[PDB]
Automatic annotation (TrEMBL), chains A, D:
Keywords: ATP-binding, Disulfide bond, Ion channel, Ion transport, Membrane, Metal-binding, Nucleotide-binding, Phosphoprotein, Potassium, Potassium transport, Transmembrane, Transmembrane helix, Transport, Voltage-gated channel. It catalyses: K(+)(in) = K(+)(out). It comes from the Eukaryota. One of its GO terms (molecular function) is voltage-gated monoatomic ion channel activity involved in regulation of presynaptic membrane potential. Inward rectifier potassium channel that forms the pore of ATP-sensitive potassium channels (KATP), regulating potassium permeability as a function of cytoplasmic ATP and ADP concentrations in many different cells. Inward rectifier potassium channels are characterized by a greater tendency to allow potassium to flow into the cell rather than out of it. Their voltage dependence is regulated by the concentration of extracellular potassium; as external potassium is raised, the voltage range of the channel opening shifts to more positive voltages. One of its GO terms (biological process) is response to resveratrol. The chain holds residues 32 to 352 of 390 of the full protein. It is found in: Membrane. Residues 150-321 form the Inward rectifier potassium channel C-terminal domain. This is ATP-sensitive inward rectifier potassium channel 11. It is a multi-pass membrane protein. Residues 5-142 form the Potassium channel inwardly rectifying transmembrane domain. The keyword ATP-binding applies.
Length: 321, 271, 589, 321
């Protein structure tokens, strides 16, 4: 009833009562990139406004400690020119840290403390610039968003091929980009017991994808049929056609790995298939046509499938003719 | 709003309940009249006031005296009249009732619940009647002196009622939990004292000590959680009881500083 | 144009002319910087550890461990919030004669208040996460705030303005407070040495004796249980098991280890006192820490209606206490903490009463395990008497321990009451308050009368209850012989013996409640006629009138319970007499 | 007694008497990123202050060589305006290199040497900016800190499954992030001799992880049981239950590889297991529950294990029934 991963690719886990939070604290960076978009915007503006206001308060404290905030002056230079308010010191800290430098507010060589605070402000300004801009580019450049453009079938199918019952599904690209070294991991996740009484709630046992060599690696240009033949040692060996219903302890997850050709950064697309999502005795229609010296593929009829005369029993009894 | 207090007051008698409400309500009226006469008297600018103060004081003395004797007399009447009817009703019963109902329950009534209606209902009746009418009279006179008090009186009343409704289901559930863990400890005592010879014959002393340890652990932790419940509800209610003094102080000081209040009515409302 | 330090004339107070750290707004500006340092360090750390975790992910079920000095840090934090809101009030009343919004009196104290609440929230978050590799931010914050507070204080003393101005005594309390915070900080350094050199929570759902002190006061852990109360009702499952100190057999290890060291009812008394006197004096010291906070009611009333009956720039302390808004706020905070301390005293008294019951029931079971059946067969005790002893007498001991610290703190409350009565009203307060010491020996008189009434009543109730037990057991004989009318007649004879004792008991209790009420109102009549007549007319204001009335009310408000207390202690006395009788009975060799 | 890698993941090696240091010198970059945090902060501030002070000394030397430091002036322009101290030249070099440009100190076209030194200062300023900011972002973006969030069991267990003795342990994630193409390497490191007298101190022989296909690659969402069955050719084939004690020449290291889903940069988590850390005859409890249409996992009881009736002898004699 409750699926493991969604049809969209979202894992329905909870992670309740995690004990150690110090290991969460000891990497702030992965927690920093792994945020929502308004939280990342908020911490971006929070870090920059915090640094600007802190150095604003520092510059205003320096301009107060030298006493040039009092306009009763002689002829001596202030440590920062034309600062006579906290807001003017804030604007000066703005011009310093983001390196605008209008020059109406500028630093004279009177205060050496002003020189020192300008040095540390420039150092941590360059540091916060490197951190925040690299972090926001890594945030916008992660490739889980690329997995939104790799479609799957709503329904995985089981039919006959080469005398054997195989488990087929279709997966295609939506770009003329590539998924470099696109691997396939197909795992059967269900509750099973050991013969020795060991009970495990989600035993992620993985069927091998039938490739031709055995290395699970595909070439996704056209939406090809990926398929796993049901062997005797396969965990689908005793699957009934009547088993494909709701409230059936069976889930097939298909994990497409690879790296995006454009960004060069890697990714992973995932999808699920429940028992009442699997059609028995059906096969996919051909969706690739060839004309005008090219090849055409109709993604509008990507998911369609036809009925096929198929033996209505498990792959175990198929081996007895 | 249960039928039990209706049976209680019907056993009390109409004369006694009318004397109860007359004594208690006029006692709170004579006390609130004595502070009102003090507030009207202390702003001087002989014996125009402050001599009916004396007869008012002695009237309050004898009126709480008759309040005390009517609560003890209703206590004695419900002691005499809840007994001698239960006893005559139980003694005229078929033994089909005795063969069905456990005798331990009936003797637990005849011990514990008569003990409550003897030694606890007059004291709790007094401390309910002395508290609640003092509270509502003081609310009435902080309403009189400060006329703007009602618009903040309704928020505190509605949050009092809603925290009470938030708490009442937990209090009922945990109180029933304390009673159903109160039962098996006493029945374990009653069955140990009878079969003491067998339980010393069997050499089964340590395991029954363990069983009483488990029973007392369960009973003590249920009474501990009921204690924590009552203290949590009381500390939230007393936080509201501090906020009402805050709002009484701030509205009396707003309506004394640029108004007319004559500096005694604010002391009345603050007291 | 809002301005730090204000724009009074030519911005002349911005000048450094006489030297650095010589301007008051300059040492206020130095006072600003540790608070904003603390916020700007804490808020990213508080963000990244907690709240950065998303909606599905939930942390840290149980088994935290408190740092040493945690009680002292929280108490010092609460008085820090009190002195900082007093500083905020001083900032508001300072800029009443001057215009143009001197922000140096508000914003240091405001950022100090924000730093205080964020420091205690950060301490709580690092406490329940038990990571002492952090909190050096708190160490450097307390040093920085302490240094700038010493700078401001010695510059107060350098200009020689003090002890009548609120800022001076305020800053002195704040700097000794920050010194105590640095002391508890290096105490966290010293023991639990982490920088430069657990308690069992397997199945327990109580959590009360090991939690932070605010939620010890407010019982905030049970907010989850009352949240789950509007769900499935609570069971003995998910009520948890017992904490080890409040486990049974642990008390009664304490009680037998007090008994063997004791080497008799009076011996039982003194060794029970040795067993539970620590928790009992903690109960009563919460009780006397309360009701002196209660002795700020009448002082606040006298202050507000005493005002209402009428060195650059400063608020004197007398004019600060002349202002009645802050006296009302002080009264609100005082009543807040007073009710909190009274509730805590109630809780720990009931906890040691529960522990007393859990020990002595096990001791009764140990005596009943070795009791010879000859005592049961020949007279002196029945099974009904033994279960009566448990199910009534143990609760009588428990209720006496519920109401013990109240009678311990009664004389202290009334003596501070009569001394504060002498603080106003002059000598006529004593001639108005001598009626209470006149009616104090008749409390002993009615205590003796109540005592003999209860002594008769317990014996008669034992008689009637065992008679009812044998009648209800032998119902079958009784009805088939048709003897129930004469047996009910014998039961009504014992019931007449009940009612003839309960009538005198009720009459004497009504005598004591008549003694309990209207003696304070007689006291105010005596002192008020004897103040306006036969005495010199010495300031019969509304002020001392309502202060004395509220003081008499708060004096007699703990008087009005005493009848139930003396009934409880006489029931406990005859209870422990029967207890020492049963515990000294025959055995099996 | 001395473990090879720690339980935390730290290798306890020494690397004594390394001869060639020129190969250390011939890559300064990996040594630059592989520093402690205060050393990286120190070399950051050292490089920037060194460049600023060097060009400060250059600008002050130019303003001295043109003689405009002497205030006895005619009407001719200085090569840099309003410089009359070394500190003012330092502030000017500050405005040049970090590109603030207040303009009170600015360059006129009088000195061509000033133009040339401004060109080289801007070039190596852009160079040092690229080097230091990319280096500090790669320092904060390396993913050994991600390995702090991948937990393991304290105790690996050996029990029965499918009639065979298997070697099990549990490993789970603490985020809703992913480890893309998460591989497992389990190696037995111990001292063994050859039959021909070759003695080797730490022979890292690796057991294969029992997967179902044989490709050591998992799908870490829930904390799953990874386990290696003890085959005849496995090096655990002659392991006694009484062998699991201290001072026993046996160590099991578990190396989880993969790439972080968020950053896209790769990582490796590692852990060890000694002989007195391995429990015999025990198996892990199930820690995955299913409710509210989702799945819940209790990491507080992640490490708990129960006792199991198991034959108290080695896997060799188990093959003789």
């Amino acid at each position: 009833r409750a699926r493991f991963v969604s049809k969209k690719g979202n894992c329905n886990v909870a992670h309740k009562n995690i004990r150690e939070q110090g290991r969460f604290l000891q990497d702030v960076f992965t927690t920093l990139v792994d945020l929502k978009w308004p939280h990342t915007l908020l911490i971006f503006t929070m870090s920059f406004l915090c640094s600007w206001l802190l150095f604003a308060m520092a510059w205003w404290l320096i301009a107060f400690a030298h006493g040039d905030l009092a306009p009763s002056e002689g002829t001596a230079e202030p440590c920062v020119t034309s600062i006579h308010s906290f807001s003017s010191a804030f604007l000066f800290s703005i011009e310093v840290q983001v390196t605008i430098g209008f020059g109406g507010r500028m630093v004279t060589e009177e205060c050496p403390l002003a020189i020192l605070i300008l040095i540390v402000q420039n150092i941590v300004g360059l540091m916060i610039n490197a951190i925040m801009l690299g972090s926001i580019f890594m945030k916008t450049a992660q490739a889980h968003r690329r997995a939104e453009t790799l479609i799957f079938s709503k329904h995985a199918v089981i039919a006959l091929r080469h005398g054997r019952l195989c488990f087929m599904l279709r997966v295609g690209d939506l770009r003329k980009s590539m998924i470099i070294s696109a691997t396939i991991h197909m795992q059967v996740v269900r509750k099973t017991t050991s013969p020795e009484g060991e009970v495990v709630p989600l035993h992620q046992v993985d069927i091998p994808m039938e490739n031709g060599v055995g290395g699970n690696s595909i070439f996704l240009v056209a939406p090809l049929i990926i398929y796993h033949v049901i062997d005797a040692n396969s965990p689908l060996y005793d699957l009934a056609p009547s088993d494909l219903h709701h409230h059936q302890d069976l889930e097939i997850i298909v994990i497409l790995e690879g790296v995006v050709e454009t960004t060069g950064i890697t990714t992973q697309a995932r999808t699920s298939y429940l028992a009442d999502e699997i059609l028995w005795g059906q096969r996919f229609v051909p969706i690739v046509a060839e004309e005008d010296g090219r090849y055409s593929v109709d993604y509008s009829k990507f998911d369609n499938t036809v009925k096929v005369p198929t033996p209505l029993c498990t792959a175990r009894q198929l081996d007895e003719d | 709003p249960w039928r039990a207090c209706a049976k209680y007051l019907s056993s009390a008698g109409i004369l006694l309940l009318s004397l109860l409400v007359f004594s208690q309500l006029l006692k709170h009226m004579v006390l609130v009249a004595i502070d009102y006469w003090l507030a009207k008297w202390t702003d001087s600018a002989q014996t125009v006031y402050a001599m009916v103060f004396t007869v008012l004081c002695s009237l309050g003395i004898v009126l709480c005296l008759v309040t005390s004797v009517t609560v003890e007399w209703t206590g004695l009447k419900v002691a005499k009249r809840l007994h001698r009817s239960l006893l005559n009703r139980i003694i005229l019963a078929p033994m089909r009732f005795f063969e069905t109902t456990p005798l331990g329950s009936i003797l637990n009534r005849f011990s514990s619940d008569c003990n409550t209606i003897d030694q606890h209902i007059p004291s709790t009746l007094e401390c309910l009647s002395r508290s609640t009418l003092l509270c509502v009279s003081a609310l009435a006179v902080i309403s009189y002196v400060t006329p703007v008090f009602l618009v903040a009186l309704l928020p505190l009343a509605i949050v009092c009622y809603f925290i009470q409704k938030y708490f009442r289901v937990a209090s009922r559930d945990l109180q029933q939990l304390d009673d159903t863990t109160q039962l098996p400890l006493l029945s374990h005592f009653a069955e140990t004292v009878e079969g003491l010879t067998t339980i010393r014959a069997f050499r089964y002393e340590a395991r029954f000590q363990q069983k009483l340890l488990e029973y007392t652990d369960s009973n003590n932790i249920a009474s501990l959680f009921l204690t924590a419940a009552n203290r949590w509800l009381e500390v939230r209610m007393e936080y509201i009881g501090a906020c009402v003094v805050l709002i009484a102080a701030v509205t009396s000081i707003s309506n004394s500083l640029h108004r007319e209040l004559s500096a005694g009515l604010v002391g009345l409302g603050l007291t | 144009p809002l301005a730090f330090c204000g724009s009074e004339n030519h911005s002349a107070a911005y000048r450094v002319d006489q030297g650095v750290l010589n301007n008051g707004c300059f040492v206020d500006a130095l006072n600003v910087v540790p608070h904003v340092f603390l916020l700007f360090i804490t808020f990213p750390i508080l963000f990244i550890g907690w709240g950065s975790q998303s909606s599905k992910v939930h942390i840290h079920h149980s088994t935290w461990l408190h740092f040493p000095g945690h009680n002292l840090r929280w108490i010092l934090t609460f008085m820090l919030l009190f002195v900082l809101v007093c500083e905020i009030a001083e900032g508001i009343l300072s800029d009443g004669v001057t215009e143009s919004h001197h922000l140096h009196l508000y914003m240091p104290a405001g950022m100090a208040f924000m730093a205080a609440v964020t420091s205690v929230v950060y301490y709580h978050n690092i406490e329940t996460s038990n990571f002492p590799k952090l909190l050096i931010a708190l160490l450097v914050y307390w040093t920085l705030a302490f240094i700038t507070k010493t700078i401001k204080f010695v510059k107060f003393l350098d200009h020689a303005i003090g002890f009548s101005q609120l800022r001076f005594c305020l800053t002195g309390l704040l700097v000794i407070l920050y010194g105590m915070l640095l002391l508890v900080e290096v105490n966290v350094i010293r023991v639990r040495r982490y920088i430069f050199f657990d308690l069992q929570d397997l199945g327990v759902r109580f959590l009360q004796p090991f939690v932070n002190l605010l939620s010890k006061g407010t019982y905030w852990w049970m907010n989850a249980f009352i949240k789950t109360a509007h769900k499935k009702p609570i069971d003995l499952r998910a009520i948890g098991k017992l904490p080890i100190a409040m486990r049974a057999l642990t008390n009664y290890q304490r009680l037998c280890e007090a008994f063997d060291a004791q080497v008799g009812a009076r011996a039982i008394w003194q060794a029970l006192s040795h067993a539970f006197g620590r928790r009992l004096v903690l109960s009563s010291t919460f009780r006397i820490l309360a009701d002196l906070l209660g002795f700020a009611g009448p002082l606040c009333i006298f202050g507000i209606v005493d005002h209402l009956g009428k060195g650059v720039y400063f608020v004197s302390s007398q004019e600060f206490l002349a202002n009645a808004y802050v006296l009302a706020v002080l009264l609100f905070l005082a009543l807040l903490l007073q009710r909190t301390f009274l509730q805590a005293s109630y809780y720990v008294a009931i906890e040691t009463g529960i522990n007393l019951r859990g020990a002595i029931q096990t001791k009764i079971y140990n005596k009943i395990m070795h009791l010879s059946t000859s005592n049961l067969s020949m007279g002196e005790m029945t099974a009904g008497q033994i279960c009566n002893l448990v199910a009534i007498d143990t609760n009588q001991l428990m209720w006496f321990f519920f109401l013990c610290p109240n009678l311990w703190a009664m004389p202290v409350q009334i003596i501070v009451g009569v001394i504060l009565l002498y603080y106003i009203l002059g000598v006529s307060a004593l001639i108005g308050a001598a009626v209470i010491i006149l009616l104090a020996p008749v409390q002993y008189f009615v205590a003796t009368k109540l005592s003999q009434a209860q002594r008769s009543t317990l014996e008669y109730s034992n008689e009637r209850l065992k008679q009812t037990n044998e009648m209800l057991r032998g119902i079958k004989l009784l009805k088939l012989y048709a003897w129930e009318n004469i047996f009910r007649t014998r039961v009504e004879t014992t019931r007449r013996k009940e009612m003839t004792s309960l009538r005198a008991f009720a009459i004497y209790t009504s005598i004591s409640i008549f003694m309990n009420t209207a003696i304070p109102i007689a006291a105010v009549l005596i002192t008020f006629v004897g103040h306006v007549s036969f005495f010199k007319e010495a300031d019969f204001s509304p002020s001392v009138a309502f202060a004395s009335l509220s003081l008499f009310h708060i004096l007699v408000t703990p008087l009005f319970l005493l009848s139930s207390v003396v009934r409880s202690t006489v029931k406990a006395l005859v209870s422990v007499q029967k207890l020492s009788e049963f515990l000294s009975s025959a055995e099996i060799r």
